[PDB]
Each structure stands twice: as structure tokens, then as C-alpha cells.
Amino acid sequence: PFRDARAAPDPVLEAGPVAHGPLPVPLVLDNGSFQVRAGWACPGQDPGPEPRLQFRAVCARGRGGARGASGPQMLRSPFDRNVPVNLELQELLLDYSFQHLGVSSQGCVDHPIVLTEAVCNPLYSRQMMSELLFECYGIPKVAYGIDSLFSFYHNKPKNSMCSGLIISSGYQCTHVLPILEGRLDAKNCKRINLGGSQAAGYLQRLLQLKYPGHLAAITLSRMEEILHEHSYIAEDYVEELHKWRCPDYYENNVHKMQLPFSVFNLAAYHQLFVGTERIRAPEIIFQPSLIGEEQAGIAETLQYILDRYPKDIQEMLVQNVFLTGGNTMYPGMKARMEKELLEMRPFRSSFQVQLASNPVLDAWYGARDWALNHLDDNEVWITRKEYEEKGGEYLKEHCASNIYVPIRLPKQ
Amino acid sequence: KDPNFVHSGHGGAVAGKKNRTWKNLKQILASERALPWQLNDPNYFSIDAPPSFKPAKKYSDVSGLLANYTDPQSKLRFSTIEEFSYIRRLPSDVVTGYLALRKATSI
Amino acid sequence: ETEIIEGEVVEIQIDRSKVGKLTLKTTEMETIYDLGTKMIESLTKDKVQAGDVITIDKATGKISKLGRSFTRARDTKFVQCPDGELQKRKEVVHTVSLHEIDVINSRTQGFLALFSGDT
Amino acid sequence: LDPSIFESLQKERVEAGDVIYIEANSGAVKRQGRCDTYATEFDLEAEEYVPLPKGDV
To answer: Which residue pairs form cystines in this protein (chain B)?
Structure first.
């Protein structure tokens, strides 16, 4: 059967668990369209003791304005396509995180932060975000970096310059990030405009049209369970679905995902038999024409971005294919990726496919390790006063952050 | 209490006829395309993946098995004789569902 | 193993390379197929028309027609539509004499010497 | 390839996406079918589609 999801934990804190040593201790903030997660950087502690505040990045407020259910409690989200594009909800989303993390005393957030952002971020979105973050929250210095390259930075052997493909896959996008001696090669980097949200929406739509007898009993928040728990990506899809064609293998693998009970009852309380549906939804990021989209998908994009390099520099980045983000939770994801890669590498040539030590939380642990290592750097952070002489589109180009384009934004 | 009490007017629709939030992503991209970009610059839209170079494999609607066939009436695609015996019994409510589920000609 | 299509052709459409679209029916299913160029230059070449029953060797594009279906015997032999699915993975057993392999190997079209006696 | 092997590809009516056997001593060439990744290129085409070889290049 399904479970049901948690709500309303009590992660309340003091003015803040501010660590010893130098005065600043930064917040580590990860923003993505599935979940926000945030914690103090906890310097001098080798394992992060708690990536605090795991909660769904979706919020509600009363029709008289009287209360705001920002935490895990219909609802709305401040992102579009895994970039933040909001003010009036983005503030109450930040407020919830700071209020649970602890606020020191005065009319600003106390101490510096690393805030995770989209691969490329539209200049206006970083401007709107830095404007919120300096006008309302007043942070003394700020770092912007990428969830994917942070999770890579954690999974590195060392504080060393590296080359690789980051195969990222968040809630509403999956991106192939080629990197060259720590620099994200944003000139020829690519993304597929699909992810876990669209695979879960597809898995909902499949079971809606399979079971019109109870369109209300299935729901997106239950599809998120069977998509994480019981779905798997094929070793190769046209062969997996061929072994699903025979009733003996089908009956051995079709899942009794029962609805909660009050004819054999199943007309109202079905076992919701999922068979090829526990494959189809995972395959969306490899074959997005399953949801009708004409995008090249994660296998042909990896070929298309890779073959644009000189042959002698394709090797030392296929030497670190790095799988990361929420969809890489699927069992078999490494085993699929190394086949899709063997089918396109030169005949004898080596490749290496690494999976993030945690498929998703390593974005935050990466931003933590990054902030801990870069805490006392000057040139690496946007310092508060720089926002009076740079327009808020500005970026510092540290490792695990995007290219900066010398530019300005007109506004009134 | 809180990190602020006098939150500034960042540029949502404070009192206009338009919706309260900022410009949506399509409007951010439509305005970002007006900037003095060079040909090599990391534009957020230039990161879009190619259109697929392969023709996309036909997977059946009702069961996900490889589809050799498409129905002249319902335009669903199917793999076996008993799947046709099911597709012709479906209500139009879900036929227009499965076509829209892969964004086919159904509107 | 052999790929055979068989059915009554229900409807057939062609237009200018060339693009076109064919439909077939068994007693138990229907289909619409877009046609590739080397099918267009076969369905048109063999003058296939709606109400014919046809068998297509898919790998070669040969149209073995079987007359017209009984539901279009109004306005050639007549026959009932094929049963089962349209595209069958048939298995064909085949037998060739050891001499008959010896002769196929003898000339540019050695197999005529099976019949003509030139062997 | 030398131009005489290319004449043989052209006599075998080979195009991009065909599965080919080349022998580098004999200069023998055989088309074996279209690679089945293109088997959806038309719904019926008068060709045989073979799966991409499960063997060394």
C-alpha cells in the first residue's frame, strides 16, 4: 500500500546555533522547486550533523491574509522551471527558514549565506533575488552557486580543479554540465526542460486514464511515493518493456499499490496494478517524446554536447560522468547511464560513471563544505556594499558557480 | 521578532491592473533578449537541448508495450489484438486524454 | 523468421518525393500506417485499391494480393478478411536440395539451370 | 575507406543509419538492414530493421 506523508514537525531553535572560532558562521541555503533545505554551515564539524529543515517548497496563506502556512503543512510555489521568479511568496518562504534557523536580534539576517540558484540564472531573476536578499534580509555577504556543482564539489577527492559531465536532474529540469578545470563550460552546456515534476505528473495522468472509477483516490502527493519507492529506470527500455510483454514476468513484477480501504472491493479500493508504468515515468528524462516533447533527452544531449569538443579533451571529462539531483534516486540509473555511454564512446576507450554519495542532499552538503572552505575569502562573495555599485545581476565566478557576463539592467 | 518590518516595493504590481507577482519566466526571457548579447554569451535560452535527431519509438498508450499499430478512429497506438478489444471500448473522455497525454492533434 | 503484414486494405492515400498513408483491417483489428518511399513505389506499382485483401512481405515490399473481401464483393476471387493481428512474425520452414545449392552457385542466375537443364 | 570500397557501399545502396559489415582485407561489403533505432522513420517502409550489433565494432 501507500503510506501518507508527514507534516508540521517542530524544528524550533534559539537565536541561532552559532559556532565558535571567527565571528561569521554562514547559512547554507538550497532552493529547488521540489524542496527547500537550509542549515548553519557548522564549521569545524567533519560530518554535517543536520541538513536542517527538509521541507517541500510549496506554501499557502489565508484568504483574509491572517496566517501563512509556509512550512510542510491548495498551495503555490515561487519557482517556474526550477528558477525562482517571485517576491510575495519568496519572502514568506525565506521567513519560515530564517525563523526556524534562528534570528539574532536586529532588523537584518545576522550573518553571510550561500544561496543555491539555477544553472544559468536569468539576469533579472538574480537581480530580483539579490534585491529581496539585500533590501529585506540585509545579508552582510552572499554567495550564489549551483546545486549540481556543489554536489560534485562534495564528491571530489580534494579541493582541486577537475573536469567532468554533471548529469543533473531536479524537479523541473535536467542539465548536462560539462566542466573544464573547475570552469562550467556554459558556452555549450545544455538542459532538457523536463524532470521529476513532469514524470510524476505523467504517472498521475497514466493512472487517471487507467482508473476513471476513482480519479479522486490517486493524487500527485501519492505518485511521489511510487515514483521514488517502486519505479526503476530500464537497462535499455525497448528490451525491458519487451520482457514486460509476457504474463509470467508481468505477474512476478506488477505491484499491489493498494489504496486505503473503507465485488472484491477493488472497484473502489484497487490494488492499483503498476507494471510498465513503474518504467515509463523514469524514462521521461531519457525519451521525452513519451510525454510528446520533441527535446533530445539525456542520452542524445550527452552525445551532442560531447562531440563538439576535440577528441583528446572528450576523454578527461567522460572520466568523470557525475549523476546528481532527485531523479538519480532511481535504482539502475548508473547501470543505464554506463550503457547509454558505452554505446557512444570510441570502441576501446574508458569512461567512469560516478553517482553522488547521496543523490540529492549532496547539493546542500556541497554548499556546506564550500561555505566552510570559502568562509574567510573576500573575492568569492558579493559583499553587501557591492550591491550599491553593481546592479544585483552580478556574480563572483567562484568554482561551483556560473559564468558572469559584464552587463547592467535598466530599471525604474 | 523578525529580520525586517519595512519591506520595500521591489517591483511586483503594487497597484496596477496586472497580476501581483513579477513578470513570469516567458516575459523575463522576452525582456532578457533585448540586452546587448554577444554571439558566445551564456544566454539562459541557449542552454535548451536540440530537437531529437532520431525518430521517436512508438510506445502503446494503454500498456506501454512497443506499438506496431495506430487506430484509424481513436489514433491511440497499441501492440496486440486484445489491446484493440480494449481501446474501442474506452469512453471518449480518456481517448482525448491519451492523445493529449503525448500532446497529439487533440485540442 | 519472417515479417508478414496481411489484411483488407480499407483506405489508401498518396501525394507529391512522395508521402502517403495506408490502412488495413483483419476480422479483429484496424490500423493506419504512414508509408515510406519504397512502399509508395509498390502499393501504386501493383495497383492496390480499397477492398483488396493483401499480404506484404515487409522486408521486401512484395504485394501478394488475394482477391477482394466479401464485404466489398459488391461492385477477381472473393475471400474473408484475415484473422488475428495485421503484422505476424511468421516462422517459415524451407527445404533446398543439396544439388540445388550446388546449382545456385554455378552462374550469374544459376537457379535457371535447376529448371532449364543447362547444369 | 578507399574510393573503391565507397563504390561498393554505393552499390549496396547504403545510407546513414544502415547496419553494415565491412571486411578490410577482402573489401567485401554487406548491408544487413537499417538500424532499428530508425524503425519508426515510417510506419511501413519496405526495409528490414536489425537491432544495433551486440558486438565489437
So the answer is: none
Phi, then psi, of A229 in degrees rounded to 5: -85, -45
Interface test with D, best of C5, C34, C42, C62 (most D CBs within 10 A): C34
A81 touches chain B (CB under 8 A): yes
CA distance C3 to C87: 7
Experimental technique used to determine this entry: cryo-EM
Alpha-carbon distance B22 to A124, whole Å?
10
Sign of the alpha-carbon dihedral angle for A246, A248, A250, A251:
positive
Residue C22, H or E segment: strand C19-25
d(CA B5, CA D19): 70
From the list C10, C29, C87, which residue is nearest B84 (CB)?
Answer: C29
Are β-strands D18-22 and D29-35 bridged in parallel, bridged antiparallel, or unpaired? Answer: antiparallel
Contact A311, A304 (CB under 8 A): no
Question: How many whole angstroms separate alpha carbon C58 and alpha carbon C88?
Answer: 10
Partners of C63 in beta bridges: C56
Cβ neighbors of A145 (< 8 A, separation 6 or more) are: A114, A116, A117, A367, A370, A398, A400, A401
Residues of A in contact with B37 (CB under 8 A): 405
Facing residue for D46 by CB, picked from C22, C32, C60: C60
**Which residues are within 8 A (CB) of A157 and not within 5 positions of it... i.e. 6 or more apart?**
none
Smallest CA–CA separation between C5 and chain D, in Å?
10
CA gyration radius for chain C?
Answer: 18
The C-alpha atoms of residue A119 and residue A117 are separated, in whole angstroms, by 7
Sign of the torsion angle spanned by Cα atoms A125, A127, A128, A132:
positive
Residues of D near C (Cβ–Cβ under 8 Å) read: 41-48
**CA A247/CA A263 separation, integer angstroms:** 24
Q: What is the 3-state secondary structure (H, E, C) of chain A?
A: CCCCCCCCCCCCCCCCCCCCCCCCCCEEEEECCCEEEEEECCCCCCCCCCCCCCEECCEEECCCCCCEECCCCCCECCEECCEECCCCCHHHHHHHHHHHHCCCCCCCCCCCEEEEECCCCCHHHHHHHHHHHHHCCCCCEEEEEEHHHHHHHHHCCCCCCCCEEEEEECCCCEEEEEEECCEECCCCCEEECCCHHHHHHHHHHHHHHHCHHHCCCCCHHHHHHHHHHCCCCCCCHHHHHHHCCCHHHHHHHCECCCCCCCCCCCCCCCCCCECCHHHHHHHCCCCHHHHCCCECHHHHHHHHHHCCCCHHHHHHHHCCEEEECHHHHCCCHHHHHHHHHHCCCCCCCCCCEEECCCCCCHHHHHHHHHHHHHCCCCCCCEEHHHHHCCCCCCCCCCCCCCCCCCCCCCCC
The DSSP result for B34-97, as a single string, is TS---TTS--TTTTBPPBPSSPPP-B-TTT-SB--EE-TTT--EESSHHHHHHHTTS-HHHHHH
Nearest CA in chain C to D44: C35
User: A382 and A142 in contact (C-beta within 8 Å)?
Assistant: yes
Q: Which residues of B touch D38 (CB under 8 A)?
A: 54-55
Q: Do residues A79 and A33 touch, judged by C-beta distance below 8 A?
A: yes
Question: A123-135 and A90-101 are packed helices; what angle lies between their axes, rounded to 10 degrees?
Answer: 50
Q: What is residue D25's three-state secondary structure?
A: coil
Residue A141, phi then psi, degrees to nearest 5: -150, 150
Q: Chain B within 8 Å of A119 (Cβ-Cβ)?
A: yes
Instruction: State the smallest CA–CA distance between residue B22 and chain A in angstroms.
Output: 6
